[PDB]
């Protein structure tokens, strides 16, 4: 229902506030340094989860912490065919998480993809370009799925021709 420009702008202003990360050695093991949003072992270092959604199916969850932020987002699988094609697209993107330094190797339960930014990423990478990548993903994902649906339809038609024409 709601248009795409307000939804992205609300997400951007939220995510811009959550990337105020810091370096923070953990309290629970001698001198381990680990993202509190994933280890969750002390709870005065976790921020209140916040959620932005444009309808009942497309929602972005932001889970902050003193040293990390986890961003997990869901996209509308409007067709039976899109569920398959979206799962495969996410799988093949998630299969390369060592190159997308901010990407988890598994999604958060009930979300299609989920990013994890550490303080180190906001120190080494351009922080504002990490936001722009999350936004650029969120803009393009459904155009990319639509292209796959068309390209599969095309293949099915050409393969049907190559059988029938021989009779």
């Amino acid at each position: 229902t709601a248009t795409l420009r307000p939804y992205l702008s609300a997400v951007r202003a939220t995510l811009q506030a959550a990337l105020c990360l810091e370096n923070f050695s953990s309290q629970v093991v001698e001198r381990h340094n680990k993202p509190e949003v994933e280890v969750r072992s002390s709870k005065e270092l976790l921020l209140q989860p916040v959620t932005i959604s444009r309808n009942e199916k497309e929602k972005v969850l932001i889970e902050g912490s003193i040293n990390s932020v986890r961003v997990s987002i869901a996209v509308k699988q409007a067709d039976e065919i899109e569920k398959i094609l979206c799962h495969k697209f996410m799988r093949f993107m998630m299969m390369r998480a060592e190159n997308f330094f901010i990407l988890r190797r598994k999604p958060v339960e009930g979300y299609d993809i989920s990013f994890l930014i550490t303080n180190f990423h906001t120190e080494q990478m351009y922080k504002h370009k990490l936001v722009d990548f999350v936004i650029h993903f969120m803009e393009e994902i459904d155009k990319e799925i639509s292209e796959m649906k068309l390209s599969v339809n095309a293949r099915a038609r050409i393969v049907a021709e190559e059988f029938l024409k021989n009779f």
Partner: protein, 281 residues
């Protein structure tokens, strides 16, 4: 490969090799090999009784009882003649060559041996085509369990011979993708005006077949071909029979490939996303 080829390479290779050494005469080396094909066929090539000079091919179709009701016996004799020896134990057909008497037409005998599964199936079509080409109509309908949960119904009508492939899709991916392919088969005449009518019924038996215990369920599909006199006639029947009996595996083969084709494109689309994130470094 877009189409599945009809001739088994293992027969085509091993017989061509053995008959080559027979033409050179150098040695009757032993052979013993077993291999499957589609449809649960289970071939065997062996030396009979240990006679290294004789070579015997056997077929093992699980559905040959209630296929030889539709010929599938006189046809094998018409095509193979002297080569159609008595069945080997446990197998329904055997076919014996020897390196002493095989003719110089080596390429013909080896190619026709590779067709052995096709020459078993072909008799049901050749019979029902000849019914349609001669105007009988009241005859019984051929039911052939080419797999154990998946059955072909060949029916003759004064204008038509129709070939209903019941089929089963094992994963939900295959149901969703398969339902796309057969939509393009439904319309496929739009690009090929002479092609046979293809109907697809999904979960439910087609309404004329609805007088037998045809299955119902989300995994089941019925595909109906309609073959006109431009296909069933004596000039076209052989090519038509070659195409039709492979259709079921043609469909499942391209389902597999289309999933692979998607994977190629997904890796490309991923790489063009990664190219964006690299600008954040």
């Amino acid at each position: 490969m877009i189409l599945l080829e009809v001739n088994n390479r293992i027969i085509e290779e091993t017989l061509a090799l053995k008959f080559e050494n027979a033409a050179a005469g150098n040695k009757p080396e032993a052979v013993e090999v077993t291999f499957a094909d589609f449809d649960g066929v289970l071939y065997h090539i062996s030396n009979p009784n240990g006679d290294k000079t004789k070579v015997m091919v056997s077929i093992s179709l699980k559905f040959y009882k209630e296929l030889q009701a539709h010929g599938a016996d006189e046809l094998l004799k018409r095509v193979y003649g002297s080569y159609l020896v008595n069945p080997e134990s446990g197998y329904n057909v055997s076919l014996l060559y020897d390196l002493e008497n095989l003719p110089a037409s080596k390429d013909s005998i080896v190619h026709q041996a590779g067709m052995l599964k096709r020459n078993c199936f072909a008799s049901v079509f050749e019979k029902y085509f000849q019914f349609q080409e001669e105007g009988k109509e009241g005859e019984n309908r051929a039911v052939i369990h080419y797999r154990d949960d998946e059955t072909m119904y060949v029916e003759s009508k004064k204008d038509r011979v129709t070939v209903v492939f019941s089929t089963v899709f094992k994963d939900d991916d295959d149901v969703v993708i398969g339902k796309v392919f057969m939509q393009e088969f439904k319309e496929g005449r739009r690009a090929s005006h002479t092609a046979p009518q293809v109907l697809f019924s999904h979960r439910e038996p087609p309404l004329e077949l609805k007088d037998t215990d045809a299955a119902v369920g989300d995994n089941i599909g019925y595909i109906t071909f309609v073959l006109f006199p431009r296909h069933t006639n004596a000039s076209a029947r052989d090519n038509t029979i070659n195409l039709i009996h492979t259709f079921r595996d043609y469909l499942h083969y391209h389902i597999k490939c289309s999933k692979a084709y998607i994977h190629t494109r997904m890796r490309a689309k991923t790489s063009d996303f990664l190219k964006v994130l690299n600008r954040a470094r």
